[PDB]
Amino acid sequence: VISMKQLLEAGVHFGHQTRRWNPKMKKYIFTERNGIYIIDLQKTVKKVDEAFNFMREVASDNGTILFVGTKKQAQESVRDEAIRSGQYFVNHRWLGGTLTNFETIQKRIQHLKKIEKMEADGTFEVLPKKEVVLLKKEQEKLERFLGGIKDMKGLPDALFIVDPRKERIAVAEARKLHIPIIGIVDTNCDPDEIDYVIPANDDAIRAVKLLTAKMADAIIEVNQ
RNA sequence: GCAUGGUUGUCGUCAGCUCGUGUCGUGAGAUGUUGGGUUAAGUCCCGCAACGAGCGCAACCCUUGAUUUUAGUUGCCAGCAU
Numbered sequence: 001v002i003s004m005k006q007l008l009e010a011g012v013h014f015g016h017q018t019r020r021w022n023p024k025m026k027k028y029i030f031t032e033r034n035g036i037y038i039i040d041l042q043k044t045v046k047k048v049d050e051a052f053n054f055m056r057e058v059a060s061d062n063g064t065i066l067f068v069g070t071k072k073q074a075q076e077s078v079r080d081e082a083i084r085s086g087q088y089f090v091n092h093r094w095l096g097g098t099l100t101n102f103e104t105i106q107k108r109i110q111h112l113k114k115i116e117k118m119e120a121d122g123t124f125e126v127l128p129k130k131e132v133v134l135l136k137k138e139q140e141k142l143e144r145f146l147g148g149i150k151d152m153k154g155l156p157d158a159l160f161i162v163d164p165r166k167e168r169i170a171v172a173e174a175r176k177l178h179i180p181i182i183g184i185v186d187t188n189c190d191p192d193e194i195d196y197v198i199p200a201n202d203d204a205i206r207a208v209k210l211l212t213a214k215m216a217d218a219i220i221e222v223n224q
Numbered sequence: 225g226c227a228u229g230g231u232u233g234u235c236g237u238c239a240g241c242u243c244g245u246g247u248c249g250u251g252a253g254a255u256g257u258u259g260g261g262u263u264a265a266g267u268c269c270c271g272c273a274a275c276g277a278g279c280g281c282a283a284c285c286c287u288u289g290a291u292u293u294u295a296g297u298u299g300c301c302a303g304c305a306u
C-alpha cells in the first residue's frame with residue numbers, strides 16, 4: 001500500500017552495475033539508465049501488497065518471525081524494527097547451521113542463560129580473577145553472536161532477509177527445512193529461490209527502511 | 225613373548241589424535257583441525273559452513289632461593305661468670 005512516489009523519494013529504483021546483473025531479472029527491468037538498471041516501480045508496489053498479505057497469516061496464530069540483517073546497511077535497521085514486533089532477528093554473523101543444527105545452538109543458548117543468571121543473585125567474587133575475566137569475555141562473545149533469538153522457542157514459520165546474495169547460507173538451509181522466505185532482491189539476485197521476491201535497491205538505508213517499516217507495522221496488529 | 229594377562233623401551237614431554245550434531249560429494253572422503261599475527265605448545269584472539277566436546281599442552285604436587293607467628297631439645301651462645 002506504499003505509493004510509488006514514496007519509493008521514488010526513497011531511491012528504490014536504483015540497480016547494480018549493468019556488467020553484473022542476473023538475466024532472470026529481465027522481467028523487472030525498466031529502461032536501463034546510465035550504467036544503472038532501473039526497475040518497474042509498479043511491479044514493486046504490486047509485490048509489496050502480496051508480501052504484506054502473506055506475512056499476516058503466518059503470525060495470525062501468534063507465531064514466530066525471524067529477520068536477517070547480515071548486510072552492513074541493514075544491521076541496526078532490523079534491530080530497530082524487530083523490537084516493535086516482538087520477534088527474532090540476526091545481526092553481525094549468521095552461525096553456520098543455525099536452523100539445521102538447532103539442538104547445539106539451543107544448548108549454547110542455555111549456556112548463555114546460565115551465564116546471565118550467574119551474577120544476578122549468586123556470587124562471583126569467590127571465583128579467582130582469571131575465572132571472572134574469562135567468563136565476562138565469554139559472555140560478551142556469545143552475546144554479540146546470538147543476541148536476539150535468545151528466547152526463541154521452536155523453529156520459525158517465515159524468514160526475512162535483505163541480500164539473498166550475501167546470506168546464501170540462510171536461504172540454502174531454509175529451503176531444506178521447507179519454510180518460506182520473503183526478502184528484497186537487487187538486479188543480480190536469484191528470483192526462483194525466493195518465494196515472495198520484492199524488487200528494490202538494497203544498498204540504501206532509506207530503501208530498506210521504507211519496506212521494513214511496512215513489514216513491522218503489518219505484524220503489530222495481526223497478533224490480535 | 226607369533227596364542228596371552230601384567231610390566232617396560234622407542235618416536236618424544238614431540239604437539240598432536242579424535243568425536244556428536246550439522247553441511248558439501250554418486251562414492252572412498254571433506255570441513256570443524258585450513259587463513260593472520262602470536263607463543264615453549266591446535267597456547268590466545270581475529271576470520272570463516274560450522275557449533276561444541278574428549279584425550280594430550282598449561283595449572284593442582286615435591287624441592288631450592290626471601291620473609292611473619294607459635295616451638296626452644298639432644299639445637300644455637302650476643303649480652304653473664306667458670
Ligand SMILES: [Mg+2]
Pocket residue numbers: 225
Ligand atoms: Mg611382542
Ligand SMILES: [Mg+2]
Pocket residue numbers: none
Ligand atoms: Mg582431518
Ligand SMILES: [Mg+2]
Pocket residue numbers: 237264265281
Ligand atoms: Mg611442550
Ligand SMILES: [Mg+2]
Pocket residue numbers: none
Ligand atoms: Mg594456525
Ligand SMILES: [Mg+2]
Pocket residue numbers: none
Ligand atoms: Mg586444547
